[PDB]
Amino acid sequence: EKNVSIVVAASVLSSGIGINGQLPWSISEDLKFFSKITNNKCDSNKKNALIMGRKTWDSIGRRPLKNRIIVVISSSLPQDEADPNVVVFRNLEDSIENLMNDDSIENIFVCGGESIYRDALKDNFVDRIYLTRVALEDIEFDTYFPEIPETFLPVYMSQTFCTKNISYDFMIFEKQLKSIDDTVDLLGEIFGIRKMGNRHKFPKEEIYNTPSIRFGREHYEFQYLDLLSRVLENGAYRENRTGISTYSIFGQMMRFDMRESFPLLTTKKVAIRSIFEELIWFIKGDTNGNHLIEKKVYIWSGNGSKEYLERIGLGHREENDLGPIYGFQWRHYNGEYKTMHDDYTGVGVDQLAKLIETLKNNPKDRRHILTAWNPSALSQMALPPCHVLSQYYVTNDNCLSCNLYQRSCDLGLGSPFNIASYAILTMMLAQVCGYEPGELAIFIGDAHIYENHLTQLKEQLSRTPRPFPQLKFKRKVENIEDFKWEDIELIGYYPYPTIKMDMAV
């Protein structure tokens, strides 16, 4: 018995692998991954056999790969006994004689060819599958990768990598001590809620996104999805200011990479434009909700309405005057707020400007902080800061990392918007201060799910994540408030269909 693995790079959605006798992309990291995953062996006296179709053998220029034995499947090619590194077989079944014979082979890799892949899967010869998902689909294919049968299960999904603005992921599909566990379970039986481990129970399979992936949950969307599962599992059913009660947990975090990708969720189509527009709406220090509504962004509609304002004791307020809310605290901290029409230029403390200036004049400073929590202005605000305070870090290799603390988190609506918003903000601050994006860490206080989002989020959990998209700016601005929506280019975003969820006013 010998292990037979499949190595293949296919597109994310249609699973295209080739076009016109060649690859529809050029990724050096992918080819290198192939070379390394095929050169991996234990015995130095042994080699790995590489099975591929005739057309694939033509694709590589009919030249052998070093330290490996290429097996070409063809009905026309002759059994060229000259080259000891290349061998030709009539059929795929007969080609797998590496098992019964030639103990000089340690591993077998089914390496190419839709005609080869399809009948290597159909006749069940494959043990493992190394799938390299690539994030393009608006191109032309003529050769596809066959749909993976239910006999295989994903056990690994790497973080999203980027090469030439192309997103890609590495996945592994597999064909499928007690003492500590027992002790912990027993202690969990003796002590009840006393044992903190029982307060943070591991999510059940029924609410665990892609349960088969246990140790290889490297993709950073899992940082959010596993949180969703955790709230869905240990969430204490509690009431709030709105009529809709939530399942809530306290003290959580999510990490994100921004160097090789952009933390925009793929399990649900997220309105990026609204996020950006809200972000630059903050940056300008604007508190007029209509300015957001005029651009067809209605995320601040419910918290702006006359009924809601009069209800929270702000009946004197105009139809969409949100008050000294974010941006106003960024650009005019401790500034006496009147109306949304007044010109608050020069007044208050401009945290954002000083933040940029400090970021570029003193990167290794341990104070880069932007806050929005102002006790003196909380009573005037239409809604107190959820994403309360942020801190920025400049690494030694000139990268910009961002930490954000969030007192309250709507895992259905608010969360993705916050992640993407502070990601984009981090990128803006990076370009303005002359750095590159780094990492995004979000620390959450009250992580909760509204009871009217249950079926929706449980639907979202039934979707296996796709590689994060890329975000590129079309032009470099001199002032951070000069950013426009047309300046934003989102590359390789192929998310699952949108999920409609109502906001609790």
Ligand X SMILES: Nc1nc(O)c2c(Cc3ccc(C(=O)N[C@@H](CCC(=O)O)C(=O)O)cc3)c[nH]c2n1
Positions marked active-site:
386
Q: Which residues pair with 400 in a beta bridge?
A: 394, 437
Give dist(CA 33, CA 407) in Å, integer.
42
Q: Which stretch binds ligand NDP (CB under 6 A): 20-28, 95-103, 302-310, 488-496?
A: 20-28
Residue 501 touches which of a copy of itself, ligand X, ligand UFP, none (CB < 5 to 8 A by kind)? ligand X
- The DSSP bridge partners found for residue 284 are none
Of residues 416 through 435, those in contact with ligand UFP by CB under 6 A are: 418
Number of residues this chain uses to bind ligand UFP (CB under 6 A): 12
- Only one of the segments 217-225, 314-322, 403-411, 481-489 lies at the binding site for ligand UFP (rule: CB under 6 A); that segment is 403-411
**Residue 60 contacts which entry, ligand NDP, ligand UFP, ligand X, none (Cβ below 5-8 A, type-dependent):** ligand X
Q: Does 116 bind ligand NDP (CB under 6 A)?
A: yes
Which of 43, 38, 172 is CA-nearest to residue 111?
Answer: 38
Contact of 98 with 2, CB cutoff 8 Å: yes
**Whole-number Å distance between alpha carbons of 100 and 138:** 44
Per CB under 6 A, does 158 bind ligand NDP?
no
Binding residues (CB under 6 A) for ligand X: these are 7-9, 23, 28, 30-35, 60, 65, 111-112, 132, 270-271, 274, 297-299, 303, 383, 410, 413-414, 417, 501, 503-504
321 binds ligand UFP (CB under 6 A): no
Nearer to a copy of itself among residue 53 and residue 385 (C-beta)? 385
**Span from 8-16, 250-258, 263-271, 379-387 in contact with ligand UFP (CB under 6 A):** 379-387
Q: Radius of gyration over alpha carbons of the chain, in Å?
A: 27
- Nearest-angstrom CA–CA distance, 420 and 403: 13
- 203, 414, 438, 469: which one binds ligand UFP (CB under 6 A): 414
**Interface with ligand NDP, residue 18, by CB under 6 A:** yes
Q: Per CB under 6 A, which of residues 6..35 are in contact with ligand UFP?
A: none
Nearer to ligand UFP, 173 or 224 (CB): 224
Residue 4: strand, helix, or coil: strand
Residue 480: helix, strand or coil by DSSP?
Answer: helix
Phi then psi for residue 72, to 5 deg, are: -95, 130
From candidates 114, 169, 226, 410, binder to ligand UFP by CB under 6 A: 410
Handedness of CA 212, 214, 216, 222 (dihedral sign): positive
Q: Work out the end-to-end distance of the chain between its first and last CA atoms, rounded to an integer number of angstroms.
A: 63
Q: Using the minimum distance from each CB to ligand UFP, give the nearer residue, 131 or 322.
A: 322
Write the residues followed by a gap in the chain (C–N more than 2.5 A). Answer: 176
Dihedral through CA 241, CA 405, CA 444, CA 412, nearest 10? 60
Which residue is associated with the tokens 């795929």? Answer: 92
Cα-based distances in Å from 18 to 22, 140, 145: 6, 9, 9
For position 408 contacting ligand UFP by CB under 6 A, the verdict is yes
Cβ 51 vs Cβ 110: under 8 Å: yes
Contacts of ligand NDP in 334-393 (CB under 6 A):
none
For a copy of itself, the closer of residues 220 and 328 by Cβ is 220
Report the interface residues with ligand NDP, using CB under 6 A.
8-9, 17-18, 21-23, 53-56, 59, 73-76, 90-91, 112-116, 143
Report the interface residues with ligand UFP, using CB under 6 A.
240-241, 366-367, 384, 386-387, 408-410, 414, 418
